[PDB]
Design a protein around this nucleic acid. Structure first.
Ligand SMILES: Nc1ncnc2c1ncn2[C@@H]1O[C@H](CSCC[C@H](N)C(=O)O)[C@@H](O)[C@H]1O
Length: 327
DNA sequence: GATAGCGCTATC
DNA sequence: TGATAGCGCTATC
């Protein structure tokens, strides 16, 4: 994550829905905002969240009375994506976990915040011939909000990871906000190698498999893209090996394969998956952030989380627009 | 709860 | 295309 000198959200309160690790909180608080409520139902996530922020998020949002939610200016929500991701069954709203957006919609109806800040995977944008994104657009447009939606790739914002996500920013219409803009991409000068831990600390992650097959020579020059070097087994998800000179593939939450949830990398002649700390770094989390004691849950947590830096630039731009009120 | 082989969709 | 990559699925212990 980045240092923010000009706090654009000072004095504003926000809600951290589907909190997970608290990525949205880190991003918004770094801009000067105050979190007044958090919600997350996974026991392990609640444990890490509490370990880092001192509070336990409230449980199952589907059974929380919206009138109970504290007044706030900004609603944050990286809602579930299993139902829309290119990696899943794409059941959408018909999935037991694909209707969470409507829980957001009904919170917005009751609390009517100044801004609604949501996040989800890239495929959400095209899922079901684009009908799902339109349902969200109309739902917000009808709750009386504008709808700014764009797909940003983390590699365009200082973080070496090919994580493409759709970011949705909605302003209450009375706040005639007509100058919101998504952050402008800039050159990437940090790569996977720059974030790795010393070999002594990751020896246990090294995998040596007879069916390891290198298909491409290691690259000498850093590039802002993923570069596959080899594969293990059939080369399905989590069986692919990349160059640390390029960028990291998308970390996942339920991912399988020998290099489950992080993918494999060629480091000093050895192939290994990333350490939870490196995942934290690949996601833009500061080293001060405490990871969960269960490595598997830690990978899962960072897996469906958000890249803090991207959130920061957007959050900064949200406050910039909110603060431009000339006479 | 942790581990890992998979198998199919989206993109150009 | 043909090659690549995905906040996933889920069987087993
Ligand atoms: N009904 C429900 N109530 C509360 N949390 C829920 C929920 N259904 C799903 N979730 C939570 O939705 C989250 C989606 S992942 C969002 C990650 C988050 N922005 C971060 O930075 O970590 C998961 O952590 C999941 O446990």
């Amino acid at each position: 994550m980045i240092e923010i000198k000009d706090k654009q959200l000072t004095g504003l309160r926000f809600i951290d829905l589907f909190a997970g690790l608290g990525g949205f909180r880190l991003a918004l608080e770094s801009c000067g905002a105050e979190c007044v409520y958090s919600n997350e139902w996974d026991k392990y996530a609640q444990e890490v969240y509490e370990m880092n922020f001192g509070e336990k998020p409230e449980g199952d949002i589907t059974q929380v009375n919206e009138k109970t939610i504290p007044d706030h200016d900004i609603l944050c929500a990286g809602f579930p994506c299993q139902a829309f991701s290119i990696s899943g069954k794409q059941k959408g709203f018909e999935d037991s976990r694909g209707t969470l957006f409507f829980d957001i919609a009904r919170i917005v109806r009751e609390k009517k915040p100044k801004v609604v800040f949501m996040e989800n995977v890239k495929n959400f944008a095209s899922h079901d011939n684009g009908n799902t994104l339109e349902v969200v657009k109309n739902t917000m447009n009808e709750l009386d909000y504008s709808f700014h939606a764009k797909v940003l790739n983390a590699l365009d914002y200082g973080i070496p990871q090919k994580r493409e996500r759709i970011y949705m920013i909605c302003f209450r219409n009375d706040l005639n906000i007509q100058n919101f803009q998504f952050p402008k991409p800039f050159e990437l000068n940090t790569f996977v190698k720059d974030l790795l831990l010393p070999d002594s600390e990751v020896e246990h992650l090294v995998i040596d498999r007879k069916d390891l097959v290198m298909t491409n020579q290691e690259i000498e020059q850093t590039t802002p893209k993923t570069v596959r070097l080899g594969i293990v087994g059939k080369g399905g998800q989590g069986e692919r090996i990349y160059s640390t000179r390029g960028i990291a593939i998308t970390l996942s939450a339920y991912g399988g394969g020998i290099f489950a949830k992080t993918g494999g990398y060629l480091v000093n002649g050895k192939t290994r998956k990333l350490h939870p700390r490196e995942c934290a770094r690949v996601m833009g989390y500061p080293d001060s952030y405490k990871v969960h004691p269960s490595t598997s849950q830690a990978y899962k947590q960072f897996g469906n989380s958000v890249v803090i830096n991207v959130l920061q630039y957007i959050a900064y731009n949200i406050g910039s627009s909110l603060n431009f009120k000339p006479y």
